[PDB]
Design an enzyme around this catalytic site. Sequence first.
Site, PDB file in Angstrom:
ATOM      1  N   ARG G   4       0.834  -1.191   0.000  1.00 32.30           N
ATOM      2  CA  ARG G   4       0.000   0.000   0.000  1.00 32.30           C
ATOM      3  C   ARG G   4       0.871   1.244   0.000  1.00 32.30           C
ATOM      4  O   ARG G   4       1.724   1.368   0.883  1.00 32.30           O
ATOM      5  CB  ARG G   4      -0.849   0.089   1.212  1.00 32.30           C
ATOM      6  CG  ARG G   4      -1.745   1.292   1.087  1.00 32.30           C
ATOM      7  CD  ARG G   4      -2.412   1.516   2.389  1.00 32.30           C
ATOM      8  NE  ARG G   4      -2.991   2.833   2.390  1.00 32.30           N
ATOM      9  CZ  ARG G   4      -4.224   3.105   1.993  1.00 32.30           C
ATOM     10  NH1 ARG G   4      -5.054   2.182   1.510  1.00 32.30           N
ATOM     11  NH2 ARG G   4      -4.695   4.317   2.246  1.00 32.30           N
ATOM     12  N   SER G  58      -7.321  -0.288   1.676  1.00 36.51           N
ATOM     13  CA  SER G  58      -6.955  -1.127   0.529  1.00 36.51           C
ATOM     14  C   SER G  58      -5.494  -1.376   0.322  1.00 36.51           C
ATOM     15  O   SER G  58      -4.649  -0.584   0.714  1.00 36.51           O
ATOM     16  CB  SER G  58      -7.463  -0.554  -0.784  1.00 36.51           C
ATOM     17  OG  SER G  58      -8.890  -0.644  -0.714  1.00 36.51           O
ATOM     18  N   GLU G 107      -8.611  -3.346 -10.565  1.00 42.94           N
ATOM     19  CA  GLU G 107      -7.616  -3.005  -9.586  1.00 42.94           C
ATOM     20  C   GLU G 107      -7.240  -4.195  -8.701  1.00 42.94           C
ATOM     21  O   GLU G 107      -6.092  -4.265  -8.255  1.00 42.94           O
ATOM     22  CB  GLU G 107      -8.178  -1.815  -8.828  1.00 42.94           C
ATOM     23  CG  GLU G 107      -8.130  -0.667  -9.844  1.00 42.94           C
ATOM     24  CD  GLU G 107      -8.662   0.684  -9.397  1.00 42.94           C
ATOM     25  OE1 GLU G 107      -8.146   1.213  -8.412  1.00 42.94           O
ATOM     26  OE2 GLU G 107      -9.570   1.220 -10.043  1.00 42.94           O
ATOM     27  N   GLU G 109      -8.055  -5.224  -5.457  1.00 42.76           N
ATOM     28  CA  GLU G 109      -7.654  -4.711  -4.155  1.00 42.76           C
ATOM     29  C   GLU G 109      -7.987  -5.703  -3.053  1.00 42.76           C
ATOM     30  O   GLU G 109      -9.006  -6.400  -3.156  1.00 42.76           O
ATOM     31  CB  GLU G 109      -8.385  -3.441  -3.817  1.00 42.76           C
ATOM     32  CG  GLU G 109      -8.289  -2.315  -4.815  1.00 42.76           C
ATOM     33  CD  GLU G 109      -9.308  -1.192  -4.610  1.00 42.76           C
ATOM     34  OE1 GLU G 109      -9.825  -1.003  -3.505  1.00 42.76           O
ATOM     35  OE2 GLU G 109      -9.608  -0.497  -5.584  1.00 42.76           O
TER      36      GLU G 109
END
Lengths: 103, 103, 103, 103, 103, 41, 185
Positions: G4, G58, G107, G109
């Site tokens: 992250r 996330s 994405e 996530e």
Amino acid sequence: APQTITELCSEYRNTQIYTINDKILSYTESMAGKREMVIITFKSGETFQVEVPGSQHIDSQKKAIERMKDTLRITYLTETKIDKLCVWNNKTPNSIAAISMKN
Amino acid sequence: APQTITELCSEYRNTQIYTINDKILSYTESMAGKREMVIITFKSGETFQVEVPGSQHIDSQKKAIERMKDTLRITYLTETKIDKLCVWNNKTPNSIAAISMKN
Amino acid sequence: APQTITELCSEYRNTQIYTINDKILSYTESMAGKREMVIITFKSGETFQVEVPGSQHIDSQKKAIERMKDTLRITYLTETKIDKLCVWNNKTPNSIAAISMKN
Amino acid sequence: APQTITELCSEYRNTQIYTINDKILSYTESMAGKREMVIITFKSGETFQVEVPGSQHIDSQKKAIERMKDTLRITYLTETKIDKLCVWNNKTPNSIAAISMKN
Amino acid sequence: APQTITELCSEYRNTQIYTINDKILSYTESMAGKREMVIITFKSGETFQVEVPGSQHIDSQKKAIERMKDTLRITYLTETKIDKLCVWNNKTPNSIAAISMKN
Amino acid sequence: GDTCNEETQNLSTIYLREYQSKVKRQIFSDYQSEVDIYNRI
Amino acid sequence: RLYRADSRPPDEIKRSGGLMPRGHNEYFDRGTQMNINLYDHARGTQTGFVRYDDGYVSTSLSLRSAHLAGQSILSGYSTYYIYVIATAPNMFNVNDVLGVYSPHPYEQEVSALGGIPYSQIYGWYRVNFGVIDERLHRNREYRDRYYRNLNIAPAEDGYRLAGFPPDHQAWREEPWIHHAPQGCG
Ligand SMILES: OC[C@H]1O[C@@H](O[C@H]2[C@H](O)[C@@H](O)[C@H](O)O[C@@H]2CO)[C@H](O)[C@@H](O)[C@H]1O
Ligand SMILES: OC[C@H]1O[C@@H](O[C@H]2[C@H](O)[C@@H](O)[C@H](O)O[C@@H]2CO)[C@H](O)[C@@H](O)[C@H]1O
Ligand SMILES: OC[C@H]1O[C@@H](O[C@H]2[C@H](O)[C@@H](O)[C@H](O)O[C@@H]2CO)[C@H](O)[C@@H](O)[C@H]1O
Ligand SMILES: OC[C@H]1O[C@@H](O[C@H]2[C@H](O)[C@@H](O)[C@H](O)O[C@@H]2CO)[C@H](O)[C@@H](O)[C@H]1O
Ligand SMILES: OC[C@H]1O[C@@H](O[C@H]2[C@H](O)[C@@H](O)[C@H](O)O[C@@H]2CO)[C@H](O)[C@@H](O)[C@H]1O
């Protein structure tokens, strides 16, 4: 002196090694009179006890019993895997003599 | 020896099993003279004590009362769920005879 | 027995309840001769002590003074919020008689 | 009674405050005969000891010596920041009389 | 007065400093009669013990042996690296006299 | 209405309070200091 | 390991007890109550932050994906960090719990319910002017024996935590149907 949980265990009568390789599933502690003990169980169904200080115990073991009840409370809370137990199997539940853990 | 807290609870008069399955909501500890005790409560509303050492306690219990207060303090702080309590119900608040925890 | 810290505090003379609702800002521990005590402060400015053992203590409070110092050291290290304190106010800093925490 | 470590440190001849405001860099513990002590060191190079029990210690100091060795092991292992130390400077290394921690 | 573990170790006959610098690989604890001890190993193949209290231990060492076994349990659980060990090499396994840990 | 919403909030807070207890069992256990009960008593 | 990008630094994270969702200040603070809803977390976007609202934070499945996300929202930050995180059952694969309703599919996530405690963060990389410094700094407080063997929570365990609104057809269909909160479905 013994170098391994297994050498140590084998110096005694009525003992048996259990390879557990898992964390304590439940911990029971009693302060009831004449039952001042800890009982632990594993997911596999085995139940072991640290037994009440009785007459089968020499003085040097009185402190070692307390130390073992401390070790069992903290390895239950931290979910540390126990590797092996050396237990006296002439008792019900079997009685803990030595404990090993490794990572 | 007993294999479970239910089994162990029933070998005494005036006891009963409470199935809590919850963390301690509050912990009270006192060093005030003649009231050196611990009192815990649950969200459900019950209150339980570890009694002040007294004449109803045989000598082997004195080390077990101390250990129980130590267990209830680290259970409270880590928010570990208590599963069942064996309590003497002839006391107000009821007194803890034994405790069990799972997982 | 009492069921809450307020109820227990009320049984003694020279006591008062402080609703702290905060963790401890600092912890001082001393082993200097005649000053074997613990001192805690809160960001509110309040300071309280666990008194050196002495003649105002009956024998059952002696294991309880040691338990209380263990509790405050670990409440400090874990940053656990204290709810209330029962203190004897005829002492400066005031001295702790009882502590409660709520989760 | 004292309300801060400085105030307490000032009550003794041969003491001084070290402002550490840092975690312990190394911990040494010994169970060797006649040198059962703990020694701590900081990144500054300053070294402190908890002395071996002896005649300079009155009987009430002996539990407080053990507790301080307990606190120093916990502090080293969790890298807790120590704020100040009150030491007797007439010993090599200087002996700890009291410790304070903040926040 | 010793400022480091190497100075401390050199005051005794039949000691040796081992530079471990690794965490403990396994921990074994026994409460079996006349075998109340702790055995630890490292990944390099090294095995050390904390001895059963006996004739060679003076009174001051009794408590210090209980503290060493307490340090080894928590160093293992927290995976802290041990820097050096001072051991009596006239015992098999070699017997811990002192421990050192840093950072 | 809120009950759907209030139940997702209540359930999501339960799973979190539970994971938080697992984390406290790890990090707070480091501070637990064992007592010599026999000399204490 | 999950990744992250975040402008909040190592020392602020230590103080907070981990990488917190928006408006939560300390990992264990129970006072300031936090709304947790995965569908709402998953749809929202924030400026200067990779999605961290409604009680979840996330992460990306790779360093490269984390860096691409950080550059898009943190480019002209003279430095920012990419945290390396152990898998554990507070983490939910958002595409697997929201499924065909997953709002930013591409994405991939993995969101952490309630934040990521400091002990679960293995380490971090510093990114200077958008260029990652390849040395990983290891977090001394990472609990290696605990996290060693843990993994992401299985999707089964999150369907009842999806947070779809009460009238959303998903509650009327598999898998979510067998797991709907009482008041949805
Ligand atoms: O030390 C606990 C262990 O004791 C065994 O019993 C023996 C004891 O070891 C022995 O030294 C003594 O002479 O006789 C005791 C008879 O009870 C138990 O068999 C074993 O179960 C443990 O309890
Ligand atoms: O042990 C605490 C427990 O004691 C009960 O009293 C028992 C006591 O344990 C036993 O020694 C005595 O001989 O019999 C009593 C019951 O007949 C208390 O009644 C109970 O509430 C606890 O305090
Ligand atoms: O117990 C600590 C507490 O003692 C009070 O003193 C009391 C004492 O508790 C009581 O047993 C005795 O009979 O009378 C004392 C008062 O004269 C202190 O007042 C209080 O500050 C604490 O130190
Ligand atoms: O308490 C440890 C501390 O003792 C000092 O010695 C004192 C002793 O504590 C006191 O009871 C006596 O009356 O006077 C002694 C001489 O100062 C040491 O000076 C100090 O370094 C510590 O060892
Ligand atoms: O104290 C543990 C240590 O003791 C050694 O034995 C000493 C003994 O303590 C002492 O009374 C005597 O004067 O000398 C002995 C030899 O130094 C053991 O040799 C050592 O292995 C440890 O067990």
